[PDB]
């Protein structure tokens, strides 16, 4: 198996064991610490930040009896979100998203989820997580997070992820509003570049959100034995939230496409303006060049040598030529 | 494909019906109960003035103008037995034309 990710900077493992009576968290940089949790009855969350170390992920997978195809999908990043159902586990593939202003680019972090017995396994490509709120929920005993099994932990991870999809959507909304104002006010090169970049980002966001909707539909409809009957409505709610996200993405995509083609309409008039400029200067200054080049010959006998006041006469002729060429324009408002 | 059910909206409490359009200026209820021999007209604002028309033995045409008032939509739907998802469809104007058959 090979790892095809851009980030290789850091590796760090956080485990969080939570139960009704008490919870335990223990950050570490080793591997054998998380191994005994395969026999733990209480729910436990294994968060392996740093997927570059293929040795540790291979060891963890071997200790958990998982198929090597799951390993080669976990190390692979450039794939759409997908869900796998198996007799002893369920495999979830999800993508995070980061947005920054002053430079409109989307960063997608591939995160994979493995759920088996009373543990959840996740694999972050890079440091930087979505799941803080569930962390303070488990640590400070908020809600019903600590009264349930690992299926509820899977639900918590997934709906935290869709919540930050909502945050991404609001950032994109502000950008689309300002870009609409900019295009309707004054379009130039950077406005068109921003519009194209926004269209590309919306393409990526759509191609990510739709498979996630399919994943959630499978989760709450296939009702696998690993997920209890009580946990279905929560996944159903997450599915509805994904529907909201997809509808907003489609609306934003249509808006951006309209912004693009309204600008792309007006190329030909700019062509006319530029070519009219070219034509007016060329038509003014080629006859002038001919006039100023004919008298430039170095012939032994030259008629204007005998002529008197040659400069005023020639420059007057050239100036009136320029004037008559200029007034030849403006007939249909060339200038 | 799936049994009908109210959807979950992230920014709203669970049992919320929201008018999705943008018109909030007009509200009136107009009825034209008619039969072979006699017909009657009256516009009104009280919603209880039109509910006893559910059990009319002759055709009646209740015309509610202004659905920003989710009060009247919800009350009429609850009195006439309309399912909450149908009320959600009525209030959602970002929609395509469709027909649904109930019992």
């Amino acid at each position, epitope marked *: 198996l090979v790892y095809t990710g851009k980030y290789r900077e850091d590796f760090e493992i956080e485990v969080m064991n939570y139960s009704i009576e008490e919870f335990r968290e223990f950050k570490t940089t080793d591997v054998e610490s998380v191994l005994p949790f395969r026999d733990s009855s209480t729910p436990t969350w294994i968060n392996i930040t740093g997927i570059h170390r293929t040795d540790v992920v291979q060891r963890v997978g071997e200790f958990f009896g998982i198929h090597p195809l799951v390993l080669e999908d976990i190390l692979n990043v450039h794939q759409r979100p997908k869900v796998e159902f198996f007799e002893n586990y369920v495999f979830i593939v999800l993508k995070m998203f980061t947005y920054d202003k002053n430079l409109h680019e989307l960063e997608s972090e591939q995160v994979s989820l493995i759920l088996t017995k009373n543990c959840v396994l996740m694999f972050q490509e890079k440091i930087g997580d979505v799941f803080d709120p569930v962390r303070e929920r488990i640590r400070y005993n908020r809600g019903i997070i600590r009264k349930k099994r690992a299926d509820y932990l899977l639900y918590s991870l997934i709906d935290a992820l869709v919540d930050d999809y909502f945050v991404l959507l609001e950032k994109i909304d502000d950008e689309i509003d300002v870009l609409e104002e900019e295009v309707l006010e004054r379009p130039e090169k950077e406005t068109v570049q921003r519009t194209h970049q926004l269209k590309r980002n919306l393409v990526e966001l759509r191609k990510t959100i739709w498979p996630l909707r399919e994943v959630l539909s499978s989760l709450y409809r296939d009702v696998p034995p690993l997920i209890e009957k009580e946990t279905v409505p929560y996944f159903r709610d997450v599915y509805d939230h994904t529907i909201q996200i997809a509808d907003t993405v489609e609306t934003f995509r249509d808006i951006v496409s309209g912004l693009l083609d309204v600008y792309l309409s007006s190329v030909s008039n700019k062509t006319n303006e530029v070519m009219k400029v070219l034509t007016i200067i060329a038509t003014i200054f080629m006859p002038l060049t001919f006039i100023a080049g004919i008298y430039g010959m170095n012939f032994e006998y030259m008629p204007e040598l005998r002529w008197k006041w040659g400069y005023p006469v020639v420059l007057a002729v050239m100036g009136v030529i320029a004037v008559i060429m200029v007034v030849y324009f403006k007939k249909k408002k060339w200038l | 494909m799936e049994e009908k059910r109210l959807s979950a909206k992230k*920014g709203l409490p669970p049992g919320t019906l929201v008018y999705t359009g943008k018109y909030r200026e007009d509200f009136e209820i107009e009825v034209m109960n008619y039969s072979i021999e006699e017909f009657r007209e009256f516009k009104t604002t009280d919603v209880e003035s039109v509910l006893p028309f559910r059990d009319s033995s002759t055709p009646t045409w209740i015309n509610i103008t202004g659905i920003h008032r989710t009060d009247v939509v919800q009350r009429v739907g609850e009195f006439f037995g309309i399912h909450p998802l149908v009320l959600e469809d009525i209030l959602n104007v970002h929609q395509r034309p469709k027909v649904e058959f109930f019992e």
Partner: antibody
Amino acid sequence: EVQLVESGGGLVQPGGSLRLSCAASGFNVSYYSIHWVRQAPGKGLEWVASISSSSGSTSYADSVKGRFTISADTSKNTAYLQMNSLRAEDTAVYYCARSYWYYIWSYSYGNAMDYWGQGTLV
Amino acid sequence: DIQMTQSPSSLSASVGDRVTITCRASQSVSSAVAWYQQKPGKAPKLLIYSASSLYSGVPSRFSGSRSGTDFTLTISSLQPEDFATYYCQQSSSSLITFGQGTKVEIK
């Protein structure tokens, strides 16, 4: 026709408890969300808490959360706000407001306070 | 807590002239911004919701606009019945917040 009337405001010893009543008229509380917004003298408006009587969903301001509790009953068609462990900064004109939800995009909804009470000083 | 910053704190204007206020959001509020007016010793009245939608029964001189996280309330021409404090409210989150107000005094 539609109007909100609030009551239950007055003097109280700091550290004590108080309750405010909001009476509805011309509308049904079960179909709307009721907010309390206070305004201390010399300062501006400050949202405190809200409730949706249909489901019981409730939110409190961070500076208010923990001690206040807002409730309502469709039978009496009134909204209540329990003010526990009052402090010197909680003195203000307390308002009752009805709001509706409007639509922006499929992911974002708004909230506008169209009808207001009259204010009860505490 | 999403803080709405509203400027100017106090404004003086002449009747019949154009007056504008600005409310700046600290966070990304989508479009859920409402403007209210409050004459002293009175309850607030809704003027504009959704940052550009005018409440029914409000004069057309009141207008709202949005440019990203910048929301502006404008009155085309002031009137004697138009001097009060104006508030901007965000309702993107369940913990809705107000501004600090903006007074309009006759000049």
